[PDB]
């Protein structure tokens, strides 16, 4: 038997790439799950204390709220370790959270007096689903989106820098009408930013409604309380999530599919970018900074990890929203992997950022391919001939002068070179 | 060699289920692709005719517009057959569309005079991408969304009808706090309608910008025309699509991934429904209308086709937005399958609708399971005991009377039966 | 409503590519399913006639066997059309096959006398599973494997032809130790032929054992007959398939997953080849026969169709072998698509063959890249230095002469050029 | 920042399920990769020492082989830690292995004398591909296959125990001809054992041929050595793997797809079993040992993990065998996940074994459903009537006596009960 460390970890998420994924440890690990379960339970008790229709839980003093707030906003590793020890006796992970809170409540008579209202009328999935939404919110807002925007801005900076650099296009791998290198990078920024907006806009849904979605227990004890209004206030007001009014025992997980589908679309664009840049490197269009070749390993590591991320995202999106009758428990183990596709994504984003920072233009190779391709000028000549109802630089001057076009058109056509035939690529690139 | 018919078709889309998919023949077949290519080319010529900066194409008479409008809005099978014959000579499908329009333009001297402006400055993908967006728009709006809404409304009608029918819940397959059958159906309506809104809201993106995205040819012939403003007017104003300002030779297909991801999420909810209903049938909770068992074949046929649809949607979403450099042509053959996942979806939707229409409540079996499960009343008794700081119908009356709870609580608790312990399921179901 | 033809077909299997998939119409269409159902039923009746333990069915005369053999080995479209008409009354597809055979048996008093033994003791899935295995056998052996072997042999011919052509290798897109173009093609042949052997070796499993796998009905009527021995004789001896002794109502479909996984592996190698050849074309290493560029469209069409084929193969392999309890009917509709992944595969194989036939070496471009890369000779110099314990052609001659290596080694090292540094690539390529 | 432990690990492979996956730490972690790289390098040096055509490396003394054998067969964590420290200076993981071996060789003048032949003529992928094959071999043979066989034998034991227990079948969820519970379990054993044989039979392929597959460096230094024969001897003879004679820089990874496809097929059968058992539990056919319901959580945890395993297996099988030209490096990061699908598989296998061990027959519920379904006897009555050319127990006795069948048939038919109508299910189950 070998002790666990990054050297011995089976998955490279916590192994080879442990340093790239460490920002997810407070969020998606069992520690993070425990952290958010504690937060939800604490806030639920505070909600009952604030609710005048639940007189059995009175408003808390500053002293009692200080203790509760410390558990919900300054959670310590020792609390999670204690919950793991408690779970040895409860054989149930959410019940262990309840008992930790009961142990903490025993420190103050004011909290001990209402210890039986911890988890009041709740089912385990009331705590779990809100925890998952809060985990996804923190992962999305504090880790994933910042890296996504860093990629977009890094590519934008290069697109503007290279906006005026003419470059031969390749369609089906072969010469095509010219563009600029900055324009080809700007195209990627625009696609990535569409998906960033979609990722940021996904509603993160939560519920709190008891065993099967119908507030049965709540209404047996407190028939006069509007539990649906309380649930919406708790979820939207206290927790800052979006309310899901119709559920079974579980929140149905459609929004997780929505979020993972959006991240996967961002990742697909980044795969396309990683492969195109690998190709530009193979052509010698980029070189090493400070010609020394640039090794494309960072783009390749990114590409490999994005494919794994997307395979996990696709599976979770396809499988999570199917649950037998009022639920089966297959989702419990699967939801322990909410951070794994995110981990492979952020490994890839860091790698793509590292690769982008190594890129320096090799203008000589770019110009070499463009000047060797005067065939790209057949298209503008044909289009000008077509307007007026009608290869080498030397041949172009004699051909154009013999055309039945206005002399002003011949003057501009005769000045045409492959590097000049870029349309409005540069203006489009500059304003990305 | 065997002649093609629905009996000999290799794919069941045009074979066994030809009658279920016939509404897609005007849209996603090669006929539909040709139809929309013709429409785009006609509208492009009309756009140039309306554009004062393109004086070489003057506004058309009513007579000339009548001919053009007939091709763009009353397209005939004979025109598509002629395009297929022309393609034998052009060896190029978009070029065959151009030649058909040139043949039609030859009928009127006014149109013949501008025949060289058909396809002016366009690349094949300018026509193809707009065609694909228009195909997806018609398929989504006229075929897919109506069926999706029919499913939601059919389930809503049953949910309201059955809103008051108490039913034992099953979590991990085993008895749980009761609900109503109508509530369990209402949950599905709510999920489906979220995805319907997402499907309807996807932007269908188009571009028209020449060979590589930079208007190179347009600007060589007409340097003074604002071609980007013209493209947005054509796409948003004339065609009613959403403009994509940054592309390569192809429109990058991210929006197709967005649309297919949304349809797939709807389909996942419907798989979940098909399987749950199969389970309710297995329990005998539904019977045949007009007890005669109901055969669940329609739900099973739906479930099978939804899985195929989603596999195709996932592949197209994952693969289409990756294209080498300024494009490779792998997307051309793949985009001929835009209607195939939609076809399997609508086969499944029709089957689910047929199955829903066969369902009739078997109240005896539902009540039998509920009355045989007094264990579900432990939860409300525990919760009431918990509020006040504290199985059979006969045992419940003696147990409750011995509790230290207010007599008003004992009166309500003693009246508890499994069929009565439904929380607010009925009110939630009725307002779906 | 539009009449069905290849122009109006929704799926390109029977649409744009109808001419490429027509060889599957006798096999995987509803016609093919019907054809094989008839074959199985006829052979089953003949098996009972030959079985001395079933005296109620006596051996058939030559006249009666002539009629039966015509249905089982010279099946006509009119019989399938009649079965479709009969199905309008039976509302059951296998029952319609039974009634067609009863109608044919009515033509001869000898067959009419035993018409009630058509389908004797069978369940629908006894007929269906054997039909599916026979469909897969004919599709694999008569269509798929011949095309797979054609690809392997076409690449082999080019590998041997080009075995001596030195070529710069590219690892991570950048120059690496040289190989020969023929060697790089030979590598593909070897991989493809491994998968061909695996495809050909899959056992195609069948069963015939009544409603749930236990011969219940057979044993009630004929308790003294060894029905398991009869089933193995029918399946292995009469039909030439492999016997599956343990099933439920359905044959469990694991072997279909085995077969589809093997075809998918062949297809993955072919995708890799299609993309590598697209790359060699982009480098100008191949040109058009009879330099004129070769358009790589055939490789791109192949690549696109292989991805679709593999997505369908993966879904059917993953979903078919899961069936609720003694079976659910979701497999029935899915198995109508057995030929669809095969269809996309053979579309791709034909396209790859067409592309291979267009390839002609462009020796000038290949030699140009090799001579411009003397850096590849650092590896052999280092290795020779390492053996004995120790860039340009002019610099290499002076560097080698100063080394403390045997003079015989310096003579061979000084003769080193990039095009000569190919190891044993040519000998490996020639013997593929 | 949080220190890594099982509590803080992002992936549940090394987190919640660390205790279930610990047997993979010596194999698939970075430690395991390093361990096998060291083994391959040591054995390669020993191969050169044994090769008379490489006189520069003489046979090793017992003392020198003792040191080398200790590194290759008694590898210590401290060696892997040292390699990680060395990698800080080399910036290259395989080069760090080379330097560790050079440091160890410095301990003995005999080994120091040939330190420059460590890694002689090798490329990094020569070491990596053999390491991967050896990792897969140990994972398959020492961890995966033993658990797979444990599942098969555990189900076999229950199948034989329950071989005589009659049970109503359910097809499309509804009553069907009876079977025995042991027969339904035996069906699973047979399917699982077919896949076990396939998993065990996959060839694990290796190569050792330098930078691009052509032995370029080897032949420059030792033109007279048969390096292909040496490679086959090393791989098949010294390492016990299967030789792959045609590769590029990488071994192409087809065999990894073969292995992962086979494991995935086993896993699909186990998903089917997990779901069927969940269903039998929901029906009350199994209860808790020592009626107390059995909670199906172990089957649900298994089912969830099998789906994740298969998604990873499918992705690696589909992506690994595609590598640009003579290779791209996307496979390097992906191959760090070789153990992750295996980890989710063994988590699921342990869970399924735990669930199987909790199952105890509830004969009362099984008999209750069977006796309430006399409709299953229509099939045997119809079949007997059909042989001779022709519901309740009381109605069956009067109906059978009125039939024109031999009196011996009526005596056996009149004795028919649903629980007796099991065909040969029991004999098939007993011999599994």
Swiss-Prot record, chains A, B, C, D:
Catalyses which reaction(s): N(6)-(1,2-dicarboxyethyl)-AMP = fumarate + AMP; (2S)-2-[5-amino-1-(5-phospho-beta-D-ribosyl)imidazole-4-carboxamido]succinate = 5-amino-1-(5-phospho-beta-D-ribosyl)imidazole-4-carboxamide + fumarate
One GO MF term: N6-(1,2-dicarboxyethyl)AMP AMP-lyase (fumarate-forming) activity
Gene3D superfamilies in alphabetical order: Fumarase/aspartase (C-terminal domain), Fumarase/aspartase (Central domain), Fumarase/aspartase (N-terminal domain)
Pfam entry (one): Lyase_1
Keyword Lyase: yes
Claim: Cytoplasm is one of the keywords in the record: no
Pathway listed: Purine metabolism; AMP biosynthesis via de novo pathway; AMP from IMP: step 2/2; Purine metabolism; IMP biosynthesis via de novo pathway; 5-amino-1-(5-phospho-D-ribosyl)imidazole-4-carboxamide from 5-amino-1-(5-phospho-D-ribosyl)imidazole-4-carboxylate: step 2/2
Keywords annotated in UniProt: Lyase, Purine biosynthesis
InterPro entries xrefs: Fumarase/histidase_N, Fumarate_lyase_CS, Fumarate_lyase_fam, Fumarate_lyase_N, L-Aspartase-like, Pur_lyase, PurB_bact, PurB_C
Gene Ontology BP annotations: 'de novo' AMP biosynthetic process; 'de novo' IMP biosynthetic process
Catalytic residues (positions): 172 (proton donor/acceptor)
Top-level division of the source organism's lineage: Bacteria
CC per GO annotation: cytosol
EC number: 4.3.2.2
Binding residues for N(6)-(1,2-dicarboxyethyl)-AMP: 16-17, 91-93, 123-124, 249, 293-295, 301, 327, 332-336
Quaternary structure note: Homotetramer. Residues from neighboring subunits contribute catalytic and substrate-binding residues to each active site.
Main function: Catalyzes two reactions in de novo purine nucleotide biosynthesis. Catalyzes the breakdown of 5-aminoimidazole- (N-succinylocarboxamide) ribotide (SAICAR or 2-[5-amino-1-(5-phospho-beta-D-ribosyl)imidazole-4-carboxamido]succinate) to 5-aminoimidazole-4-carboxamide ribotide (AICAR or 5-amino-1-(5-phospho-beta-D-ribosyl)imidazole-4-carboxamide) and fumarate, and of adenylosuccinate (ADS or N(6)-(1,2-dicarboxyethyl)-AMP) to adenosine monophosphate (AMP) and fumarate.
Family affiliation: Belongs to the lyase 1 family. Adenylosuccinate lyase subfamily.
Protein name: Adenylosuccinate lyase
Organism of this sequence: Pseudomonas aeruginosa (strain ATCC 15692 / DSM 22644 / CIP 104116 / JCM 14847 / LMG 12228 / 1C / PRS 101 / PAO1)
Lineage of source species: Bacteria, Pseudomonadati, Pseudomonadota, Gammaproteobacteria, Pseudomonadales
